[PDB]
Amino acid sequence: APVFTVTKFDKQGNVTSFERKKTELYQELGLQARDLRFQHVMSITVRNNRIIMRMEYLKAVITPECLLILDYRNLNLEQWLFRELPSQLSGEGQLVTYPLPFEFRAIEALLQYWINTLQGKLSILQPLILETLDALVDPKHSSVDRSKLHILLQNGKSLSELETDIKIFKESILEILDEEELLEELCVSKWSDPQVFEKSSAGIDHAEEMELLLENYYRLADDLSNAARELRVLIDDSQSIIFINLDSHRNVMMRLNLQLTMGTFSLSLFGLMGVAFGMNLESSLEEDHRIFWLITGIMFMGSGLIWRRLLSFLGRQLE
Amino acid sequence: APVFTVTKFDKQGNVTSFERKKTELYQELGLQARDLRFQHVMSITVRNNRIIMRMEYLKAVITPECLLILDYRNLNLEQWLFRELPSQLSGEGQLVTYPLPFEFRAIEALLQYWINTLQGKLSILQPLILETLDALVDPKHSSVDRSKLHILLQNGKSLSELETDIKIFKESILEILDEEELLEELCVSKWSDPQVFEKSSAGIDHAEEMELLLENYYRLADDLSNAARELRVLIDDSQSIIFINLDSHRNVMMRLNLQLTMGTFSLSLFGLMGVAFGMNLESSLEEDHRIFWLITGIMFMGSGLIWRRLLSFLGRQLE
Amino acid sequence: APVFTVTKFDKQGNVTSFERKKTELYQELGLQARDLRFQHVMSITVRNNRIIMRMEYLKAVITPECLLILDYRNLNLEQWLFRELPSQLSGEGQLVTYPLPFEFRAIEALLQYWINTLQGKLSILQPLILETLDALVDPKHSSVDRSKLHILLQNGKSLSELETDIKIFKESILEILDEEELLEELCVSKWSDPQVFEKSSAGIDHAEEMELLLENYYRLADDLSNAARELRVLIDDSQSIIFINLDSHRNVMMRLNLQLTMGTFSLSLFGLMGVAFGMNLESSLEEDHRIFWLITGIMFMGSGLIWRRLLSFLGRQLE
Amino acid sequence: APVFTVTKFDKQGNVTSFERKKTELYQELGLQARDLRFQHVMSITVRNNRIIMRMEYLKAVITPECLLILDYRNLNLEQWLFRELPSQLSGEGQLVTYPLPFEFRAIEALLQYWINTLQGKLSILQPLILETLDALVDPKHSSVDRSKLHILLQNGKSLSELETDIKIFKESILEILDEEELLEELCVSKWSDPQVFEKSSAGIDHAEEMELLLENYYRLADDLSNAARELRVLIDDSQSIIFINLDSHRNVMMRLNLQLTMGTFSLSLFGLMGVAFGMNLESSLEEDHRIFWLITGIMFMGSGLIWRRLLSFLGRQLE
Amino acid sequence: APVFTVTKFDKQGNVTSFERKKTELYQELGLQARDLRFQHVMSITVRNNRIIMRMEYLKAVITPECLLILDYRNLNLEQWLFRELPSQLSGEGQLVTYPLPFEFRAIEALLQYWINTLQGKLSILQPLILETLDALVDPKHSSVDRSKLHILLQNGKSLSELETDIKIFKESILEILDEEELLEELCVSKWSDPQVFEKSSAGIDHAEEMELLLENYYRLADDLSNAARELRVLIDDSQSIIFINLDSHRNVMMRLNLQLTMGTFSLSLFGLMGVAFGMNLESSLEEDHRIFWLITGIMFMGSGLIWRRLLSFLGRQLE
Ligand SMILES: [Cl-]
Ligand SMILES: [Mg+2]
Ligand SMILES: [Mg+2]
Ligand SMILES: [Mg+2]
Ligand SMILES: [Mg+2]
Ligand SMILES: [Mg+2]
Ligand SMILES: [Mg+2]
Ligand SMILES: [Mg+2]
Ligand SMILES: [Mg+2]
Ligand SMILES: [Mg+2]
Ligand SMILES: [Mg+2]
Ligand SMILES: [Mg+2]
Ligand SMILES: [Mg+2]
Question: Given this structure, which CATH class describes domain B1-80?
Fold first, then answer.
């Protein structure tokens, strides 16, 4: 029989970790089997007055009386759970929903944890990508470091995954915010005992508070998405600049090679003249003395003149 | 007369395969000819209290009493139909709509099959594309394997087709979910005998259950679309990295070729000097003895010095 | 005075072709001059209980009693009109709106013709583009065929035009479908004599039938748009693969040229040694016999060793 | 004191050009200072029953009795104003709003002028861009004409500006059309004396006529936007084809250079053999006669054989 | 205890700068701690009849009686605050909301300052980017200046950041404008003493004035966004033109190098002939006199002929 590893935080912040059979959990929470399938990444739903949330590896069930974290093992959640959550829920944590019922504090804690995780991913990726791009777009490098290219590719893949996570988080929060029915449903304590809260709520609107909390987290996620999109745009612009730099270096090297090739061609032409005039054959110019110096002088001078003329021709061709 | 190859599953899960004339099928189902044209890929409609669904090659008609699969031959559907569907509909299948009427189970089975097909396509494409990209973006390869390029092109075309299929599936599900009239129409058993279901429905809302089922499948398809889009983005980034790697290797090879060309040019210049000074002509320096060693020494030393000067010039040019 | 070449199909399918002055046509149809300007490509409007449709070169006016096609000459419409339209309207055509009034049949015929035209354009473009891309992305070609590149460019321009046509058709159909007022207006026979159709309509809803017809054609156009977009994406991916193939071939050729340049450089260095040691000058090593063989042997061996060392250096540089 | 150069057209089409202080204009029109700031490009608003329109350099105020054009000098508007506008408003112009009040004619004239301006810009840009692209994508050119590249860049910038203008025009017209309140406000003559027009309007709806006019101009602008987007897509496709053509020409030239380099390498190897065997040193093979012919024959034959072997090696490498 | 550096402007324009503990500020403004967290860039909200605005570094709280600027130090805001704001609020400033209550003037001043900041950023970036692109796309440059490339990259990053800022400003203004509840909430003076303003408002609608002000600033931001997008499109087009120019220069240089390589190959072939015929070996053609001139003449003529034939071959290959 499948089981859930459940960490339960009550309204008093006490932590109880145990394992419970899935059928027993369904019976306790008043939920069906399909409700706790957790097959969707980044899904927030309300079933039978219970808030089922899944943010990647974080699966949570919020009740009017307690919070349950499921399948928390082997995820490095022990520090976060057993240090922050008791303090955030029933201590001096940074949560600003203390006068509000427990579900507001639980939702705020979960959304704050996910926002902090996304912010940490972005704040790890951004300096690495920035320094890699700065190293790569250096104008004085003829060629780029390919190990840094592999690092940039891995970081870009991580950035795309992070951007997708931010996008789906924003989509879920926005689709919850758009409909007032979902906002009303999220107030589980209000609907658990509506008769009690008809007079308990001394002019305070739970739906308004939930809307404000979700809007705050949506705005934070929107800022994260804008930063990630800016980073992606910077990556693309840096890649274009790298392409232009490599092409410019190629053109410079090609121009130098062409000039040297013109020089070599002129030298080879007059070397052909010299070797043709210096083969082991009887001629009528061996007796003359000035002929050797005249030939070598005209060879060198013509090589220089042809090289200069070819350089001028290249300059005219390239304008 | 055109005919349909019909596989019928009753509410008890019994399977009956036969062939029926199209007019007879229209008369039996209370449908017109235009309803069963099946000319749209990924279309879900409700006509005369019958649910007509088409997911590419899968054409189905859901009635309050039975499910019909049409044109199922030569599509490798025999295994799925004759093994899963009886168990899913009237057995111990994974469907979570057993207390719900038959149309809920049929819709769940069809949507689950299509989602599984898309997931299988994605899970086949993803490892192949990942390994091909990993092989191609290897920084230590001067040139890429073009057979792997052809494989990557074919897999990218398949990925684009899969992404289009996921997109149209999401569009159909979302356009059904947006309007409450369509959700009400999908509950064919409710509207077949409204008087009976006015009291049969003991506080259970069929429209709500249909909305939950369609939302679950829409979220699954959204996850699939996000994964496919991430794969496409990774393909594009890998292609950019491949371009940068190839350009960097070209620049390195060009720099080496330019250095060797400078060396060859210096050697050719002083070889021109030597061949000019070594032609079969009478000169005034054959008698001298130190002249030969002086000439060869200055030739070699000048070749080296000119090569070093040209190397420094290249270094200055490339900064 | 400007005139219209009018082809009129009555409810009985009879065809009458003539020419009529524009003012006379306005008086007959009960329309103003601005209604029949036909200045918008792909526009469907209802003015004075008349349906004015324009699909590029096809201008039509649908009345409760007749259909008019205007400016049909020099457009290869004679075959379509004078063969299909009588059969589709008042024969055994594939139209599924025979029990419906005449305007439904006319709208179905026009939309079917336009959908068939778009499908024919796509089915002509797709095999040509596919075969051109298959020829171009061949991995064993060092260079691509530029005539095929020109053909691909022309076909891509045609594909973009077709995609724009499909997009505007979808936009017009969707904007008609979104508002129920437009759907009600399209039923010209219903509003021509509302008193008669108040009892003539035996439980059949004209607006619902019009909505179904327009939805069917919108779905067909959506499938066409998806196919065209897939073709464009395939074109872009093939272009990227062509770029990678060309760069890889360039890198391979550059590596071969660099190896041959290293060999030539070593040969030229030791040829400089030989020519320097073989100039017409008196030396102290002409008397020796083993010196010639020693010099040539060390020249060849050193050329080989330097070539191998430079090859190893290139291998180290390219990793 | 700032002043406006005002050209006023009455309902009778008479033209009066003058200059008026801004405060006097505000008092006459019953408008505040902020209404006539004209700080937004392509803005259509209704303030105090006056229609304030700005289309780039064209600033207009439409009153129930007159039309005012402001800051018309030094804009080449004299021809358009003083030739078209009197005829369009109170003559035989192409306006189709003569039975409608004056504001309909004024709005039609202004929108027609702006649409004509955009159409003229597009009809000037399109042939130039088309001919430049046709010249540039010529497959038989090894290199492209860079002056034509500069012309294409300037025309592309102009096309982007025109596309932005069309987009903002469409946005303004669509945002006016979406809300019925704005359509009602645009009928300034209706709201100037509502008691009079309560009986003056003999069954004619001013809001409907305004909606039809704005829809017509929106459709014209949509056609313009589609044409401009098609032109941009064609520019991008042509640039890609140019890239492929240049890379293919580079590959062809590189293959030729590599073949010639292989030939030169073989010739240089056997030239090294010859020069080593032809240095001024005493050897044991000068006496023999057949040795010279044997050496030269084997040199030439080996050069040819090595060249052919290297050509085959290149063919194998490039497949 | 954390404190705020508060600059307060009353309705009379008087400026008072001080520091106040955060709890004291919360008590004075009737706000909770979470309201003044200022964790969202570009957020406009209304809490407890107070307008909380944050535009990057500018944090402001608008009350019906006063305006507060928080954390204004070390931001170069002293000039703007202490020179413009007193004049804009209670002087001869350009604000057009003097008859309106104080909150209208404060909102107008803040939005005007942010719009001016964005306009200044755009007007600084645009000339720099334009001149850099004009320098880079010069057709007569074989290679581009890489320092200008780095400058262009930095300016493009700044432009992307500015475009993101404009986008978020537009999004906030538009989401405020879409809902009438937010527009009503922004009129803090109206809701502070509704009984007084029930008769104080002599036919003037505060919500309408707020909507007009926000629409004006939204249109200004839309113009800014259009200009920034045009600049980005121009940057991309210029980069494409730079790529084409570099490739064309590469092709020209490669063609010249190939022609010179063909010439060098022909010269080297006939130099091989000469050196083979001029080695120190006994032959049967030393006695002849015309043989030397015949050999050198045929060598030169054949070199020329082979060079011309290879040039023709290249011309045929490149078409
Ligand atoms: Cl290249
Ligand atoms: Mg992921
Ligand atoms: Mg909201
Ligand atoms: Mg497909
Ligand atoms: Mg929903
Ligand atoms: Mg000699
Ligand atoms: Mg067209
Ligand atoms: Mg509908
Ligand atoms: Mg390239
Ligand atoms: Mg402009
Ligand atoms: Mg409308
Ligand atoms: Mg920023
Ligand atoms: Mg509004």
Answer: mainly beta
